[PDB]
User: Fold M1 family aminopeptidase from Plasmodium falciparum.
Amino acid sequence: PKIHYRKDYKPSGFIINQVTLNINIHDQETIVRSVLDMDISKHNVGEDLVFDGVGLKINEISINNKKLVEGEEYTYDNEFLTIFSKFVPKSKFAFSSEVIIHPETNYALTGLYKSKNIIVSQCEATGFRRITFFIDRPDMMAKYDVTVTADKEKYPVLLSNGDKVNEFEIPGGRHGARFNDPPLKPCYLFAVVAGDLKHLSATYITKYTKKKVELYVFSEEKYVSKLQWALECLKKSMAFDEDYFGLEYDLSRLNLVAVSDFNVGAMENKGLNIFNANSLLASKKNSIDFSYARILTVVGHEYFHQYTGNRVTLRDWFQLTLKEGLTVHRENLFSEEMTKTVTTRLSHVDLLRSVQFLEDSSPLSHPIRPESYVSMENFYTTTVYDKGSEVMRMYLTILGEEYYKKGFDIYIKKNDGNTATCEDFNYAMEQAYKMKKADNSANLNQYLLWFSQSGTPHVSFKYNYDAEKKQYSIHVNQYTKPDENQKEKKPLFIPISVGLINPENGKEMISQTTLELTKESDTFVFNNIAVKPIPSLFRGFSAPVYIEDQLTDEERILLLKYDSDAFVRYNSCTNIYMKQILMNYNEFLKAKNEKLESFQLTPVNAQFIDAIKYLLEDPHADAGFKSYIVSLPQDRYIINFVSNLDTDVLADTKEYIYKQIGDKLNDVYYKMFKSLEAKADDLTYFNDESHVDFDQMNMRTLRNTLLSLLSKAQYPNILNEIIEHSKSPYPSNWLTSLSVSAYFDKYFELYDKTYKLSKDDELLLQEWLKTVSRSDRKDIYEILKKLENEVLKDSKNPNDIRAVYLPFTNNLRRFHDISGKGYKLIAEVITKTDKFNPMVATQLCEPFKLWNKLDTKRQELMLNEMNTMLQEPQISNNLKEYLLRLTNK
Ligand SMILES: CC(C)(O)C(=O)N[C@@H](C(=O)NO)c1ccc(-c2cc(F)c(F)c(F)c2)cc1
Ligand SMILES: [Mg+2]
Ligand SMILES: [Mg+2]
Ligand SMILES: [Mg+2]
Ligand SMILES: [Mg+2]
Ligand SMILES: [Mg+2]
Ligand SMILES: [Zn+2]
Assistant:
């Protein structure tokens, strides 16, 4: 297995200037003819001409219209086409080929494939070589002239990149369309779509050049009524890039296409963005509330790539975070501005500190710019995306909005139309840094360590107040644990957004301040501080670190009630919960280990419970924020703080804490559940697919969170409310009614009721599957077998497989059954899926990422299943390399 190394980058000895394709789709095969107009580069040293080409059936290959002969002049091993150098011209030449591929049976969903009745491509990262021969790497920029032909009745809509410059009829009921795309692009941005697509369209007029842009959103005919929100989101995305960054769309048309079978969320092919249907299609009758934020962020994300990824592209794949981290950051700015809810930023932090922090303390830990790879299909990680986004966001925190925008424009103007590297972005930010500091000696050299250093920094604090001097000191320390990528970890440039809260009146004591920690430790002193403050640390979550605030629970309660920053309030609550969890966990663990017949548990802090009540009863407080404060931290956040975590003991710990708080607040919860109904479930705009109210959706989140707490608590007669909830028109509500009925004898009645409501919409049925999968049922293993036999069957749709199994793996008590039967079940699914879709098989490995953090018995059980999977003779390259890294083999 070849290992590619970042330091080994070298430009190709060849140039591809023009790609001319004819893609002829037939019933049993697709014929791809390609002419490459090529040249010899200045780096050429007379090497063989080697093309990437995977799984291609060669009809012929030619150079300058002379047919080449296998064996004497070229070899092909189903991976690399080698033309021996004595037959390679020494000046401009044409290479041509005709190959046969088979999209109908391409169940790995890479290259050219068939999703239901739509022919569709997915070429990032190295999938273009599955369509035709190429030097398949993003620095090989070329012009593209693409003709597609197909049966007209089956495939009336034909799409590719660029302008449609001809449409024509063909004998035998066929037709063709020619697309010319003159701007240079890398081959991973090529795309083609053919199908019986229906659409919605609009015209957007750009802000400055006043150019008309045609916007088209496409789906199969059955779901065309679910396209309107995506179209609205596209218009919003275009306006945000104009308003915040001054950036306008450059092309005459932008197409968005939904397909049912897709490995990820969506893909930014130039002018032809292709989406998992679950990230483009929604309607209020057939989608849960989460769909609306998902579509907004994914449409936005693919649109923002037109600059950060498409117009400025990548020199090589080790620069992936340059487009993905930066585009996620742009997506998050956009989403925060559109939703106008503090929970948007909180949701991103919550994902980072659970899923990404787990990755970064796992054997899979890597920097956002790795040093090596074997499989590109495994490279697309929450580290590269979400830690990358936080590294991109930290520049905005350091520079402020005005100077950030200045540096960003420098990046765009200098690199537009070219490949780029992470250093090009740091350089642009550094220019803005020198301007902000008014110091041409200032630099961001240390900042580059965010790209090369793996692991999560730990930042800890000590404080001093001198009441006579009115002098306050914050002593800060940073530490990153050594790992397999760096034995010695260097201090990073850590920006710490801080406030100082006056504990007597809750007011700010200083102006906005961002401490620049550049050493292993530093002391920040503040004069004229009239009273001892409570510090508000890492406001907005200003660096991707473990925060150790060294605050008392009394101080954290004051921040939770009175601080101005949503994250610090949320984090103070998180930290209070974590202290309680660790304490009760150890108490339960000791009672288990010592086989005690009686023992004590330390109760939940009464003043903390009072503060939760205070915030819940505040009419002016935010409903989304309220739903966070009544929820314990995620299990995958908790596990970063416990060695040899016994999942049963943790489940007992959470159960005790939830019961402690509910024993005091359940009447409050019930009162709010009833009083929130009017606004949360208001039907005024139910039939307006353009009207989306994120505050109202957060009210439903709060109601459904409270109903869950009350149902688990067996609150008197709460089953009455569950049954009435099941009659709500909103799928978020009636699906919640299914999950919370798990604790009652009506569960299977609601199972059948909600199945009937879901089964005729493909995406709604997948949401139903997820709801069943995560149901807190003692008979969940029997229920999953029922799902397999009656609904899932042998579907190869990744959305179906992921819906049935991934939510269940988050069932702390049942997935981690001490028998190991949950580990066995998911391992069987991974191996089955690996036969046809290695990338999705590796996604299904997610539960195993924490294997070496569990108690020694569960470590052994997980390791056995992972070694069993590794022994499968037919294991894919993707899955083998992933499990070898994960098991430290
Ligand atoms: C899940 C998330 C982050 O929401 C998302 O959808 N991310 C997008 C994105 O980055 N869009 O811009 C994306 C697009 C394509 C791939 C990909 C697909 C393949 F078939 C490959 F073989 C491969 F190597 C990579 C991976 C992620
Ligand atoms: Mg083949
Ligand atoms: Mg505008
Ligand atoms: Mg996102
Ligand atoms: Mg289906
Ligand atoms: Mg290792
Ligand atoms: Zn992306």
In short: Residues 297, 331 surround magnesium ion (ligand 4) (CB under 6 Å). Residues 1-195 form a domain with the Immunoglobulin-like fold (CATH 2.60.40.1730). Residues 312 and 418 are 6 Å apart (CA to CA).
